[PDB]
Amino acid sequence: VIREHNKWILKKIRFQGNLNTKKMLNPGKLSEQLDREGRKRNIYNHQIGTIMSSAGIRLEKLPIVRAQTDTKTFHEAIRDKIDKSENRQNPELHNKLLEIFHTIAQPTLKHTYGEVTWEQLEAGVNRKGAAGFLEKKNIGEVLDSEKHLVEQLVRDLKAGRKIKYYETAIPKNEKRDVSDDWQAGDLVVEKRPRVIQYPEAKTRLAITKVMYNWVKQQPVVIPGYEGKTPLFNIFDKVRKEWDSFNEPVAVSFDTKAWDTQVTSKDLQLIGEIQKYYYKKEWHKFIDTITDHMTEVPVITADGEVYIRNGQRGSGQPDTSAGNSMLNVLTMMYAFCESTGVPYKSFNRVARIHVCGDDGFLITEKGLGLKFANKGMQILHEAGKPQKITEGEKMKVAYRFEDIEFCSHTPVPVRWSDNTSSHMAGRDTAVILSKMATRLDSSGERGTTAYEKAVAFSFLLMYSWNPLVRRICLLVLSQQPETDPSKHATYYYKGDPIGAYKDVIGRNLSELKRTGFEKLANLNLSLSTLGVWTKHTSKRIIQDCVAIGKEEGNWLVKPDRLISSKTGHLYIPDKGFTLQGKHY
């Protein structure tokens, strides 16, 4: 019941309001927002978002929220997770971890690794890499001017001279999932931030420059390290392994705040394993840097200074390999300690998959459930505590289809030629949540050029999800007269629908059927959290049908369902997939 001269604003409201105002009209919310520096930008990706809004998709209900980046809570964070004594660990642990290491060392590479060229280092590096605190220039900026400085540092570290290592701590500015939360009463509006602690831009360069091989895992030498493999065919290889066992089972790793749990001795162990693969001319370097990481001086963004007793500073270059290697060793060790399986017999009774602290292992029911029970406690005294759940034991998968890994589970996908396979799945709500909120930060603002790349990228990753697929298509369907932006995860050269072939190996038009069950499960939060309406499915479909009925080769015909309905198929052309900003 507002006044007339004031109803013009109403035609600008795009979403339901969220002020919860009890005695003042809250008409809704707009699609623009005030940038941290006065600017007025979009909140979402306009194109993708507009289409989502065409159907009953309330972008507002997406389980996503900004992270509290304010000093008061940032400090709470550091106090809550980081402020802790080093974990006590059974004595001999590290001997046995080393022992286990030797059962998985690749002699063909022992003492072969050394420094690498500036050229291979700068391989799509993140020039916008943070800069330090006491440091002026950032990565890239450092490449250009102070390069030679990096060199003397390397040289300094090698000589093992004195250095002023310290790490900067800052809350991470990112939108986060609250899908689990909202799914349950708790309708949080923001979430604690991840606190990043990281080495100086120059130091990061020196480090990654000589340890490129171990850090980037060029020559993956970590058993089960799967963060080098593309998420579209990963569950396929795991599928194999699963089928090889009689009555398989997957046990999931679930350590609490892993980084905060890394011991000093854990760090030294990695030091050893690193010296195992590096030419002797670098062992002092390795020892030197490792001696520093056992007690790091951290300077918070606000100015505070705390002396952290060894843990993993997410920003350390070695984090990925470091945590992955240390994680597999500990879990293997844990498995053995639990079942009775001798160390060298690991690879014969089980298969392990890891990605940083995340990971699981496949094995015969018996051995797996054993690992699952005695596991918690063994792990607990190993210094890597597992999250208390309810059935006081590790999560056990009895169905391959239930394996959770790297934030995904497998998704069944039948192809035209009745052949099958598995794609990487996730909650649609979340796919949508990332689709509408990912903008190019490695840039600023938005263009259909960008969204097109975004759509393409999600096509490669989620073609099994109809909703998403048709939305991606509708996106790609626009401005064909313009090539994609290279600021996305991926991007195509030539014809998109082609490239999907170029990478997936098959044709989109061939995606005949997606597991019904896996899909019903992956669509729950959509209803439960009120993200979509009943009509949404139909709504988006017609949206395609419309474009795709006119005479022509419509790239929206690859949906076997839309194609059917339009009476037109799409005839692909060129198309070769590339990369852009993918980690």
SS (H, E, C) 145-195: CCHHHHHHHHHHHHHCCCCCCCEEEEECCCEEECHHHHHCCCCCCCECCCE
Beta-bridge partner residues of 408 = 405
Which letter does DSSP use for residue 439 in this model?
-
231 is in an annotated binding site: yes
Gap between the terminal Cα atoms of the chain: 51
Burial label for 117, CB within 10 Å (0-12, 13-18, 19+), is: exposed
116-119 own/partner pairs: CB under 8 Å, 24+ apart: 116/209, 116/210, 116/212, 116/213, 118/143, 118/147, 118/209
AA identity, residue 23 = K
Q: Which two tokens stand for residue 407?
A: 């934030």
Beta-bridge partner residues of 360 = 252, 353
Domain assignments of the chain as residue spans, ordered by start? 1-42, 43-62+410-580, 63-222+257-331, 223-256+332-409
Burial label for 200, CB within 10 Å (0-12, 13-18, 19+), is: buried
Query: What span, in angstroms and rounded, lies between the C-alpha atoms of 284 and 157?
Result: 7
Resolution for this model in angstroms, one decimal place?
Answer: 3.0
Beta-bridge partner residues of 355 = 358
Task: For strands 511-514 and 195-198, give the pairing.
Answer: unpaired
CA angle 89, 92, 94 (to 5 degrees): 75
Q: Among candidates 171, 172, 192, 167, which has minimal Cα distance to 181? A: 192
Query: What span, in angstroms and rounded, lies between the C-alpha atoms of 337 and 412?
Result: 35
Query: What span, in angstroms and rounded, lies between the C-alpha atoms of 76 and 171?
Result: 11
Which letter does DSSP use for residue 197 in this model?
E
Query: What span, in angstroms and rounded, lies between the C-alpha atoms of 466 and 117?
Result: 45
Query: What span, in angstroms and rounded, lies between the C-alpha atoms of 359 and 407?
Result: 10
Query: What span, in angstroms and rounded, lies between the C-alpha atoms of 108 and 185?
Result: 55
Helix 466-476 and helix 46-54, axial crossing angle in degrees, nearest 10: 130
CA distances from 279 to 114, 205, 315, 357, 479 (A): 6, 19, 25, 28, 53
Query: What span, in angstroms and rounded, lies between the C-alpha atoms of 375 and 100?
Result: 17
**DSSP secondary structure letters along 284-350:** HHHHHHHHHTTSEEEEETTS-EEEE-S---TTSTTHHHHHHHHHHHHHHHHHHHHH---GGGHHHHE
| CATH node for 223-256+332-409 | 3.30.70.270
Region for residue 413 given its phi and psi (left: phi exceeds 0; alpha: psi -120 to 50; beta: otherwise)? beta
426 is in an annotated binding site: yes
CB burial of 438-475 (b: ≥16 within 10 Å; e: otherwise) equals bbbeeeeebbbbbbbbbbbbbbbbbbbbbbbbbbbbbb
AA identity, residue 62 = L
Task: Give me the helices (H) in 505-559, please.
Answer: 516-521, 524-528, 535-549
Task: For strands 195-198 and 167-171, give the pairing.
Answer: antiparallel
Tell me which method was used to determine the 3D structure: X-ray
Query: What span, in angstroms and rounded, lies between the C-alpha atoms of 325 and 273?
Result: 9
470 is in an annotated binding site: no
How many secondary structure helices (H) and strands (E) does the chain include? 24, 17
